[model samples]
Target: TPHVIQQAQARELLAQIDVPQILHKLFRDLAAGLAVQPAQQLVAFPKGAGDFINYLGVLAEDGVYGVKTSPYIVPLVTAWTLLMSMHNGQPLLLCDAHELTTARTAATTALAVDALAPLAARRLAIIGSGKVAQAHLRYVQNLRDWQHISLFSPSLASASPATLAQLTGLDPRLSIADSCAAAVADADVIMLCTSSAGPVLDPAHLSKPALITSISTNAPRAHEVPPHSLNAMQVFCDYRQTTPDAAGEMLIASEQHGWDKRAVMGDLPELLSDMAQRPDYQRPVFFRSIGLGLEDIALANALYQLQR
Candidate 1:
């Protein structure tokens, strides 16, 4: 089954996704799955996210085969492919997993926003114009009746406006902006999806009690959110582990600037018992997502089952 993507299906999955459960499962499943076979992760750096691609192919079942590949045009599909593998083992389902991935990413963030922002979480700020930006807009529209969204990008003169127009066509609520401050003010949730080398948000203008999420995988070497953000807020990483890249985020924060590295909360389990229970709309919480490959594998498997 080719499983043509439909907005109805995407909305249904988005509305019902249990992000915590999926991510939790993703953490456990991915570590163990990869542990079975020692596969090297090779990052291809080229022009853009889609241009610089990455992939993982490993043995799962004795005879069955699977590999997670991207420039995943659909942003949600990343983690969904990884999570779906817990039970379903369908590789042929990979083709349509884009819908699942794109939808799930937005829904997952919507889940985080629901669990983390202030009660008056209407305004949203986005600082990227890549594929993930499109996915985030979809979820933002669904999750919060978000009144306005401020979009900022380095090449705002060209790309940013195009992204905004596509968003408006997709759903009339989206609005585009060219100024950095316009994107940050009074924003309840600020999502950083850029793979750019430098920081995007200006720390001086950051709103208080704002919730931020950085989905850029190249972080630690570079962060979409500036290292200064770690100074006054409690920071959290999606996965408990850190690569050399993440070390850079702290190193830059400490050496380049002056900040304490010990203040970070690396364990999600501990936060689950306590912070996860806190009010969704009270204070600002930052999520550092470096991305996990198992999520791609899990989501890839989940979509395999839907093919009939």
Candidate 2:
């Protein structure tokens, strides 16, 4: 019998999930075994399948395989599913891909932040008021005891202060800024989570030794951070295969000037492994990912096993 896990159950199971453990698997085990397609083009099936599902599928030669739920709208609104199966296996297990996406994506960002951010960093700035922003708060808050968190959203500019405060769950400490500058001012870490086709916030507002990560730059030409800001940072990515094409600011910068692939420090696995050996950290870091199918598969399988 095939097991099915939906959003509520997925959220419940993931609440107690060991993110650090999952990070170990993603950086070592899964990184060693999986080949991922970060952002694939649309694929159309029959008439009812809509235009096409944006694909971010994963495959292993003789191991487990998985595909994320592919939503087809223009600036994709994600509420998807995950379908996982073993090689040559007929029984496919289904999962709430959207929730898993949220959990794993935040978990992945946390891994990078732990390695790259300054040891004493605490102040937080969120660039978008969305699901990923909240998830980043949850995971990153655990890594370091954040002292201040500011939020800014272009969409919420006209909303009342009370409404904006509600966006931050009425947290007494959380402030809603009127501009991107105010939001990111002197922040030690900035989390940019938006479906923006262009840059969303300026990089100058960030503290000198800050680390910034994005959860929504997987489109062929999508970018949340400005090109100049990206150029100023010592960049890192989750994968190498498709980031040059998928990361909006990176791609745009590469096209405008000359992209030096060697300038990129390395992928997450490389960063995680080498971090202990390198203590002389300098400059801001830009960590970006196009998402990974292996992550989805791993999360789904773990959730399924937990259910069993």
Candidate 3:
């Protein structure tokens, strides 16, 4: 029988798994041609009701395949992942993917940070205050020996004392910045963890080259940094095969700014496999991840294994 996992149980199962380790191995498998990450499938609803995207992947090494289907209905959005066995061709697990999405997304960024950020990099900046942003902080906090961690969010300006304390307590080095510019000033790694649909930061204003990471929401053309900035950065992404089509900045930069996808230096698989070189920071390094089905499936498989 297929196991059905609700949000609470899913969270517990995920905590027991080594998320980043699993993701690192998955990327290595991808580079070795043992995994398949198909482009996400987006289907529109009739009469403009809404749409849903199916993220699909196959992990041959693990003998499992799955799809995480997320729907954007009028008032709300929700996601579920259906994991299936490759050997037996039977359903293995059906899991609520809300927690899985957050964990995998942040862990992916952490993997990027480990692979891309300079060894001597000390300062860290985060550009959001939501759950995603906090999770980003959690996963990357010890990746480098950071002397300072600056965070700036629009809502933090009026956040209650308890809320501010909670964020500050996450790390002894963390401090709230009064402005976005202040938060990112002189920072070596800036993680943009917002759900905004338009550009939230511009690389042009940065005083120095740094490693920048971004993730996306379901919104059409959703991007955290200006699209044209891709022209200046040594760009990389979670997956080279599909990110250009899904990331807002990449799509816009190609169509409007004449930015070529060919300019992307590499992706997670290449970086992990040592096929791609770590960037020399002559210019800002931009890493964008539009979440992969393989990441979701890999975690779901781990959860399924735990249940067995």
CA lDDT, every prediction?
0.55, 0.69, 0.94
TM-score of 1: 0.65
Regions of candidate 1 where Cα sits further than 4 Å from its true position: 1-108, 154-164, 218-220, 243-248, 254-262, 266-284
78-114 in candidate 3: lDDT tens per residue? 8899999999999999999999999999999999999
> lDDT at 129 for candidate 3?
89
Using lDDT as the yardstick, the better of models 2 and 3 is 3
Residues 189-244 of candidate 1 have per-residue lDDT tens digits of 88877776667765546666677877665432667667766675556654454422
RMSD of each: 6.8, 3.7, 0.9
TM-score-sorted candidate list, best first: 3, 2, 1
| C-alpha positional error of residue 276 in candidate 1 after TM-score superposition, expressed in Å | 4.7
lDDT (Cα, 0-100) at 99 in candidate 2: 78
Best-to-worst ranking by lDDT: 3, 2, 1
Each candidate structure's TM-score, on Cα atoms with residue i matched to residue i, is: 0.65, 0.82, 0.98
Better of 1 and 3 by TM-score: 3
Shift of residue 266 alpha carbon in model 1, Å: 5.9
Query: Which parts of model 3 have CA positions greater than 4 angstroms off?
Result: none
